[PDB]
Design a protein around this ligand. Structure first.
Ligand code: CLA
Ligand code: CLA
Ligand code: CLA
Ligand code: CLA
Ligand code: CLA
Ligand SMILES: CCCCCCCCCCCCCCCCCC(=O)OC[C@H](CO[C@@H]1O[C@H](CO)[C@H](O)[C@H](O)[C@H]1O)OC(=O)CCCCCCCCCCCCCCCCC
Ligand SMILES: CCCCCCCCCCCCCCCC(=O)OC[C@H](COP(=O)(O)OC[C@@H](O)CO)OC(=O)CCCCCCCCCCCCCCC
Ligand code: KC2
Ligand SMILES: CC1=C(C#C/C(C)=C/C=C/C(C)=C/C=C/C=C(C)/C=C/C=C(\C)C#CC2=C(C)C[C@@H](O)CC2(C)C)C(C)(C)C[C@H](O)C1
Ligand SMILES: CC1=C(C#C/C(C)=C/C=C/C(C)=C/C=C/C=C(C)/C=C/C=C(\C)C#CC2=C(C)C[C@@H](O)CC2(C)C)C(C)(C)C[C@H](O)C1
Ligand SMILES: CC1=C(C#C/C(C)=C/C=C/C(C)=C/C=C/C=C(C)/C=C/C=C(\C)C#CC2=C(C)C[C@@H](O)CC2(C)C)C(C)(C)C[C@H](O)C1
Ligand SMILES: CCCCCCCCCCCCO[C@@H]1O[C@H](CO)[C@@H](O[C@H]2O[C@H](CO)[C@@H](O)[C@H](O)[C@H]2O)[C@H](O)[C@H]1O
Lengths: 175, 74, 174, 194, 161, 175, 42, 154
């Protein structure tokens, strides 16, 4: 249906993309490329799924070669600077090779690339078409959920200073 | 005092140069006497016509710059 | 054409009986100055906020949520506001109403475009305005009660400034 | 063909009763030497500045921004006390507004080059309050009258702050008459100087 | 300070200039009675002299051995109010006068009798021009780049050589 | 025809959409008097110099070359701390680079594109879309670096520090 | 006012004398209220 | 002729552009009526300006309240500046520019709030009347109307 029934449905939001509930009140996709916006939405979503898994795991696990922070966000400040720089350039190399060296909005989609697609299915979960369509919508909604959830986990961990699960087991309101 | 007198000397050098340069460059001709080169270097004037032409020769610009040279060295 | 509400004055030439709460009351000609759809949306917004404000004054005088009495004691009405600005309560309310108002800005701009009735956020979770006559009766009623609560809220807060009591204890005493 | 404002003088040409506030008042015949379009631009501009200025004096007496730099009830003291950086920011912002709102047609020779340009009409209607053309004539008239009244009123307020070193309504509420010993007018040449 | 000069507020010769200037006035004041107009005039002069010396002392001027304030004009910003800022004010006024006079000469060329406009000036048109000069840098530079300030060499009369 | 940057003014006649950073912005008509292609070469060269210069004003805040490790982080003092043999070598290297521009302008002025000094070692701009994006991006980052360096220079004159140090210490106004 | 008398006041010597008398007068007034301005105060 | 201050560049022998664009009538909330490009007022009209101003006013609320809020032993929150956070990888720069550098309220002592005025630095509202009336006053309060009455009885 229409997500915001009093507002008119945005003209560029056809139902073809998965996760389309007609929710564009501010007015994007009337200015920017929906192909670029969808690539940004899936990229943000997958990064935040990995981020929420990383936050939960680092609250428990720690590699022996690394120290342990007070919180998984404090884990950033005890890993050596050169390590962070190596991770940054490794992610940059992946970003370069995956997009074929076209990263700008102007050239990223000059090769007829499909938004969110990098030809990544080693386990072949997208072999079936209808199952693939369902997994597309599942992906976009789990990505959206992990985006909000990552925001929540990071800010509560900064505020309380006591993790996620230890925070829940020792909940202490603002005083 | 040395600043003010150096600027006065500069004015005197430029003015003496102006009369001498104007005399050299207008020596061959001007708008009053375009054929000034046919008459030479030292001639009195071209007469009272065309408004008056006293001191129009290149020699007369030597004459006028001699007062400014004396003023400058003064 | 003379005004039904102010008989010696003319009909205000921008107001029509298809509007809700129409009585022909625009003596100063303001409906000619501003756009009328903006004025209607502003009136319904003022109406609903003041209805909530009046009910909140009444309810706050009757009872108070657990724990609130310790943080704010003898203070009431505007007096609690400053205390709750120190705590995070007022700021959190401002944040979430501001979030709703961003979409309300988009909704109002669509109203001025002419694609939405003023005050129409399509919000009817329980079913009351199924039938058309009941929808009209509610529409006239909601503007009438909102107007009454606008003047009510005014009276309540000004009585608090004069006496320091608030609506219910001002009824009880004097 | 006599003036309505000044009944014993003739009606000045370039004043034909079309403009709002046109009562025939031009005894010195400025409109015969200076084009009436420039004069109406200047009248509307002066009046708008004064309308804001008169309101500025009154509100500045009552309501202040926070801080000790903005606590000047008397408006003539606010000029000196208010932060210089921000006052010159106001001046620079006014200059940018003047060049852009006039669309680089600022000189007496070039302004009104476009035949579409109207005296006082800069295109300023953010809330489209002048959208109704029925209200146009009385809005133009009441803008002109508010501007004239406010020019006179601000002139009075500034020179009464000079005479009495008090903010305007506080001057009205703590009034003191002129001694006449102070604030002597003229006199620079009567005493031959000093 | 700069060039071996002394700030006027601590040079002792500036102080002697002020003291000698006030003694010169006070010995003239010693020949008059208190409420007379010459006594009032000389006291006004003494106050004016003291005010001038006090202001110069606190202004950042640099006095020489003579005790007279000296001006530094090499371009340093601590002394820009002595030549650079008065110079910017001058060039604005001078360029205004030049731009306004040029605009009137070009208007007067398109007149019925161009030489009658210059001995009998059209005062409303000339006042229209005098008002335009406030934005002379932009108007004159746009005039230059649009090929309307500089005339080409072959529309200018020259001498035969 | 009307300018796009300044919608109430007419279009400047000698600039065109072909030029990468075109906005229709020439209020004082420099291109009506000077050569448009000379102005473009000058704009591109000023932009490259200011791109390096903005990076150079910021970078010794983070790290210095070991030789100049004792040198100051205020750039306007580190300018005078360098020896004249060093500045002579810098001037010679820039001179060697400017021989190619001295040969481009003044001899084959009409052969090529503005700023085309034959320096494309990594073979970018082969793709036409990438070439367009990079041309416009070079122009806009050059203009941004011009504004940025001009700022940072006068800020280093007022607060006797570098950009980052000034920001961190919150020395934002004349003390 | 008569147009021939206004045309006489528009003649070059009258306008020259009035304009430079006005100019002289506001230099005199500026040096009366603000005397001894050897520098731009800054 | 030329009247004087007429404003037409052809009456003052001034070069004009000769291009005078037609003046439209549509308006924008924080813009002006004037010649625009085609499609300009449809993308950057009243809808754009109102929505953008609304989002800027919403995003002001985190920005005006920016700081490092941390809990003590109890739930009591302490506010700190974002300068105290140290980034670990950028050499000699230990503290890093944050949102406090683009919005430095604290240095100017502003105490910013989501409403734009905090408890500290609140708007000041006073009473000019000074607790007395228009006429028939007694004490340190003598109005203009009282002086009108004073002059009329003397
Ligand atoms: C809930 C998790 C989830 C889901 C359902 C999907 C679903 C999908 N992804 Mg995404 N993805 C995710 C997490 C997820 N992804 C994360 C966290 C990463 C980063 C490690 C990726 C990285 C990634 C790439 C690089 C690509 C996909 C692609 C795909 C599609 C191929 C079908 C497939 O193998 O599904 C995966 C099924 C599971 C993960 C469930 C087990 C499908 C739409 C491909 C595509 O065509 O995208 C549109 C593609 O190119 N994804
Ligand atoms: C869904 C998103 C969301 C999130 C993440 C937060 C997060 C927060 N809110 Mg906000 N809030 C929200 C929505 C949200 N709020 C909405 C929609 C409103 C209505 C305008 C408010 C009104 C509000 C107020 C008035 C206050 C907060 C406070 C807080 C803080 C609580 C911290 C704590 O220790 O509490 C731990 C507390 C709990 C786990 C208990 C929560 C249960 C509450 C008491 C029940 C309320 C039920 C209510 C009647 C539901 C009606 C909904 C409707 C009126 C909108 C935290 C920053 C407080 C604050 O800033 O204090 C410093 C505060 O006083 N919030
Ligand atoms: C902004 C309003 C406000 C404020 C300042 C507080 C503040 C407080 N509440 Mg209350 N509370 C509120 C709204 C508020 N609450 C609302 C809307 C609800 C939902 C119905 C509750 C429900 C609630 C419960 C159920 C309890 C508190 C409790 C507490 C106290 C924690 C100790 C604390 C002082 C606790 C307490 O000590 O109260 C006695 C407690 O048990 N609050
Ligand atoms: C380029 C943008 C820019 C920047 C970076 C600054 C920076 C500064 N200005 Mg501002 N200023 C600007 C543009 C700018 N100004 C413009 C364009 C104007 C003219 C309208 C002003 C007028 C101005 C004044 C009058 C003052 C400053 C002050 C300040 C300083 C302190 C600010 C502060 O504490 O804010 C935090 C404080 C606030 C956010 C309070 C805001 C108060 C409200 C919003 C005033 C209402 C505005 C009013 C409706 C204006 C309408 C007219 C306008 C539309 C033309 C700071 C150096 C002050 C100063 O120098 O103090 C040392 C000061 O007094 N400025
Ligand atoms: C407003 C008219 C005007 C303008 C724009 C210029 C412009 C110029 N003059 Mg000319 N000049 C003018 C009037 C003007 N002059 C008059 C009236 C005289 C007679 C005294 C001269 C005598 C003159 C000489 C002898 C020389 C110049 C030179 C120059 C040049 C350099 C600037 C300079 O040396 O100033 C010098 C200015 C003067 C000596 C006299 C200026 C007198 C006043 C201040 C200006 C005229 C005001 C005018 C009445 C404006 C009325 C405007 C009103 C109608 C709206 C420049 C081309 C010099 C040159 O060739 O350098 C390359 C040069 O040697 N001018
Ligand atoms: C939706 C918007 C609704 C807004 C509604 C409110 C606004 C409506 C319009 C209001 C327009 C103004 C009305 C007055 C408002 C304030 C009322 C008020 O209390 O005022 C406040 C002041 C009086 O203030 C009084 O002060 C006293 C203590 O000294 C009292 O204790 C009270 O404080 C207060 O009553 O009112 C005046 O000063 C009125 C002065 C006289 C005005 C004219 C009187 C009637 C005309 C006859 C005069 C003839 C004079 C002839 C010449 C005489 C020369 C000496
Ligand atoms: C449209 C705007 C209308 C503005 C109206 C002006 C209102 C205020 C005008 C003065 C009010 C009362 C004056 C009494 C005060 C008075 O008359 O004092 C007298 C003073 C001369 O001093 P005396 O010789 O009177 O000394 C007398 C002894 O008693 C004391 O020593 O006259 C003047 O010359 C002062 C005015 C300056 C003259 C030049 C002004 C500047 C010229 C600018 C160009 C002309 C503009 C118009 C010039 C008149
Ligand atoms: C995503 C980038 C972006 C942001 C974040 C943003 C925010 C705001 C805010 C936020 C507080 C306000 C209040 C605001 C208002 C106006 N914008 Mg908008 N704006 C953005 C983009 C553009 C472009 C590309 C143009 C444009 C314009 C206008 C005009 C003038 C119309 C006129 O007067 O006719 C007005 C009043 C047009 C223009 O002429 O700018 C000179 C124009 O082309 N904007 N804008
Ligand atoms: C162009 C022209 C016209 C005109 C005109 C005129 C005369 C226009 C005048 C306009 C004015 C007066 C604008 C004033 C702006 C004030 C501001 C922005 C205040 C900011 C306060 C700040 C930042 C603060 C602060 C704080 C500081 C630092 C520290 C604290 O201790 C205190 C505090 C908390 C308060 C018009 C339109 C009429 C017509 C025509 O078109 C020609
Ligand atoms: C147009 C436009 C809009 C607008 C707008 C705005 C900002 C409109 C604001 C208009 C204002 C501020 C008008 C103010 C007028 C002031 C007057 C008449 C004062 C006269 C004083 C007198 C007579 C006096 C006096 C005094 C003297 C001398 C003696 C003293 O002892 C005492 C005393 C006080 C009595 C908006 C922006 C909404 C959008 C819209 O789309 C288009
Ligand atoms: C050519 C080419 C390639 C290449 C290459 C190279 C070497 C490319 C180098 C590119 C560079 C260095 C670009 C840098 C741009 C810097 C900018 C825009 C900074 C602006 C600063 C601003 C706006 C600011 C500011 C500031 C102000 C004023 C106030 C301050 O208090 C604060 C603040 C910081 C805000 C390769 C080699 C790959 C091969 C290829 O075949 C061809
Ligand atoms: C983000 C800004 C974007 C463009 C900014 C570029 C600015 C352009 C040049 C403006 C010069 C800056 O203006 C300069 O800084 C501030 C502004 O009040 C003033 O500084 C003064 O006020 C500040 C503000 O409280 C005081 O902290 C300071 O002690 C005082 O000297 C300087 O007197 C002024 O010279």
């Amino acid at each position: 249906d229409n997500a915001m029934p009093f507002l008119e449905r945005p003209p560029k939001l056809d139902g073809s993309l998965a996760g389309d509930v007609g929710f564009d009140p501010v007015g994007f996709s009337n200015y920017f490329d929906l192909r670029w916006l969808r690539e940004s939405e899936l990229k943000h979503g997958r990064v935040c799924m990995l981020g929420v898994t990383g936050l939960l795991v680092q609250e428990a696990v720690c590699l022996p070669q690394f120290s342990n922070g007070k919180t998984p966000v404090d884990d950033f400040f005890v890993v050596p600077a050169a390590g962070l720089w190596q991770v940054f350039f490794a992610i940059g190399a992946v970003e370069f090779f995956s997009h074929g060296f076209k990263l700008t909005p102007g050239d990223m989609f000059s090769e007829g690339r499909e938004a969110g697609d990098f030809g990544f299915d080693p386990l072949g979960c997208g072999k079936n078409p209808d199952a693939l369509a369902r997994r597309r919508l599942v992906e976009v909604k789990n990505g959206r959920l992990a985006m909000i959830a990552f925001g929540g986990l990071l800010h509560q961990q900064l505020l309380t200073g006591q993790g996620t699960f230890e925070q829940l087991a020792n909940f202490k309101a603002i005083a | 005092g040395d600043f003010l007198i150096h600027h006065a000397i500069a004015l005197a050098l430029h003015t003496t140069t102006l009369i001498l340069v104007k005399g050299a460059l207008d020596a061959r001709g001007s708008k009053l006497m375009p054929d000034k080169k046919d008459f030479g270097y030292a001639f009195p004037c071209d007469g009272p016509g065309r408004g008056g032409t006293c001191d129009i020769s290149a020699w007369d610009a030597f004459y006028l710059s001699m007062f400014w040279m004396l003023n400058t060295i003064g | 054409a003379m005004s039904e509400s102010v008989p010696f004055l003319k009909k205000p030439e921008a107001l029509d009986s298809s509007m809700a709460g129409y009585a022909g009351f625009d003596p100063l000609g303001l409906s000619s100055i501003a756009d009328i759809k903006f004025l209607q949306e502003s009136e319904i917004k003022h109406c609903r906020i003041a209805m909530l404000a009046a009910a909140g004054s009444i309810a706050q005088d009757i009872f108070t949520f657990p724990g609130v009495s310790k943080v704010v004691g003898t203070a009431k009405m505007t007096g609690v506001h400053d205390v709750l600005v120190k705590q995070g309560a007022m700021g959190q309310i401002l944040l979430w109403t501001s979030f709703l108002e961003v979409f309300g800005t988009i909704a109002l701009l669509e109203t001025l475009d002419g694609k939405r009735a003023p005050g129409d956020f399509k919000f009817d979770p329980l079913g009351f305005s199924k039938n058309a006559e009941t929808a009209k009766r509610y529409q006239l009623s909601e503007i009438k009660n909102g107007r009454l609560a606008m003047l009510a809220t005014g009276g309540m807060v000004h009585g608090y400034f004069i006496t320091g009591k608030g609506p219910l204890e001002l009824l009880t005493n004097f | 063909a006599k003036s309505k404002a000044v009944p014993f003088l003739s009606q000045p040409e370039a004043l034909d009763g079309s403009m709002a506030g046109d009562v025939g008042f031009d005894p010195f015949g400025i409109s015969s030497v200076i084009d009436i379009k420039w004069l109406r631009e200047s009248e509307l501009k002066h009046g708008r500045i004064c309308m804001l200025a008169a309101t500025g004096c009154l509100v500045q007496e009552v309501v202040h921004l926070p801080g000790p730099a903005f606590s000047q009830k008397m408006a003539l003291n606010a000029w000196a006390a208010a932060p210089r950086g921000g006052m010159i920011s106001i001046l620079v912002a006014i200059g940018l507004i003047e060049m852009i709102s006039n669309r680089f047609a600022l000189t007496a020779t070039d302004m009104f080059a476009n035949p579409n340009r109207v005296p006082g009409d800069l295109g300023f209607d953010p809330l489209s309050l002048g959208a109704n053309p029925a209200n146009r004539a009385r809005f133009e008239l009441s803008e002109v009258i508010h501007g004239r009244a406010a020019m006179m009123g601000f002139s009075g307020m500034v020179h009464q702050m000079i005479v009495s070193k008090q903010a305007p309504i506080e001057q009205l509420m703590h009034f003191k008459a002129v001694d006449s010993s102070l604030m002597k007018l003229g006199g620079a040449a009567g005493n031959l100087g000093y | 300070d700069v060039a071996g000069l002394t700030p006027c507020g601590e040079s002792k010769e500036f102080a002697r200039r002020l003291d000698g200037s006030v003694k010169k006035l006070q010995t003239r004041l010693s020949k008059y009675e208190a409420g007379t107009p010459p006594a009032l005039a000389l006291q006004k002069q003494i106050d004016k002299t003291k005010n001038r010396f006090d202001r110069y002392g606190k202004a950042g001027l640099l006095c020489g051995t003579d005790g007279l304030p000296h001006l530094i004009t090499d371009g340093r910003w601590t002394h820009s109010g002595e030549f650079v800022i008065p110079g910017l004010l001058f060039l604005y006024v001078a360029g205004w006068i030049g731009w306004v006079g040029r605009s009137y000469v070009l208007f007067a060329r398109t007149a019925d009798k161009p030489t009658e406009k210059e001995i009998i000036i059209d005062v409303p048109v000339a006042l229209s021009f005098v008002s335009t000069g406030f934005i002379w840098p932009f108007s004159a530079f746009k005039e230059f780049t649009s090929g309307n300030l500089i005339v080409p060499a072959d529309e200018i009369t020259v001498s035969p050589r | 025809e009307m300018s796009e940057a300044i919608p109430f003014m007419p279009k400047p006649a000698n600039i065109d959409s072909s030029m990468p950073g075109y906005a229709g912005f020439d209020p004082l008509g420099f291109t009506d008097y000077y050569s448009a292609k000379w102005m473009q070469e000058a704009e591109i060269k000023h932009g490259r110099v200011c791109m390096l210069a903005a990076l150079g004003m910021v970078f010794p805040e983070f790290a210095k070359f070991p030789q100049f490790a004792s040198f100051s982080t205020n750039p306007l003092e580190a300018f005078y701390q360098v020896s004249p043999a060093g500045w002579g070598q810098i001037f010679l290297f820039i001179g060697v680079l400017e021989t190619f521009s001295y040969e481009k302008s003044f001899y084959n002025f009409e052969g090529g594109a503005p700023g085309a000094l034959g320096f494309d070692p990594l073979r970018m701009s082969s793709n036409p879309a990438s070439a367009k994006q990079y041309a416009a991006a070079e122009v806009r980052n050059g203009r941004l670096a011009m504004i940025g360096f001009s700022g940072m220079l006068h800020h280093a004159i007022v607060s006797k520090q570098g950009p980052i140090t000034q920001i961190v210490e919150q020395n934002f106004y004349p003390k | 006012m008569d147009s021939n008398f206004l045309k006489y006041l528009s003649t070059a010597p009258v306008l020259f004398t009035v304009w430079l008398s006005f100019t002289a007068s506001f230099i005199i007034e500026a040096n009366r209220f603000f005397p001894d301005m050897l520098y731009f105060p800054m | 002729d030329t009247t004087g201050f007429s404003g037409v560049p052809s009456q003052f022998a001034r070069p004009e552009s000769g291009v005078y664009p037609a003046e439209p009538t549509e308006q924008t909330f924080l813009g002006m009526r004037g010649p625009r490009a085609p499609g300009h007022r449809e993308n950057f009209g009243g809808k754009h300006t109102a929505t953008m101003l609304a989002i800027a006013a919403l995003l002001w609320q985190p920005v005006s309240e920016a700081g490092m809020y941390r809990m003590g032993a109890d739930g009591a929150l302490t506010k700190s500046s974002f300068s105290n956070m140290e980034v670990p990888g950028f050499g000699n720069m230990k503290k890093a520019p944050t949102i406090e550098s683009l919005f430095p309220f604290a240095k100017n002592g502003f105490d910013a709030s989501p409403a734009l005025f905090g408890k500290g630095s609140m708007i000041v509202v006073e009473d000019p009347r000074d607790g007395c009336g228009a006429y028939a006053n007694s004490g340190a309060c003598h109005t203009f109307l009282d002086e009108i009455g004073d002059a009329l009885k003397k």
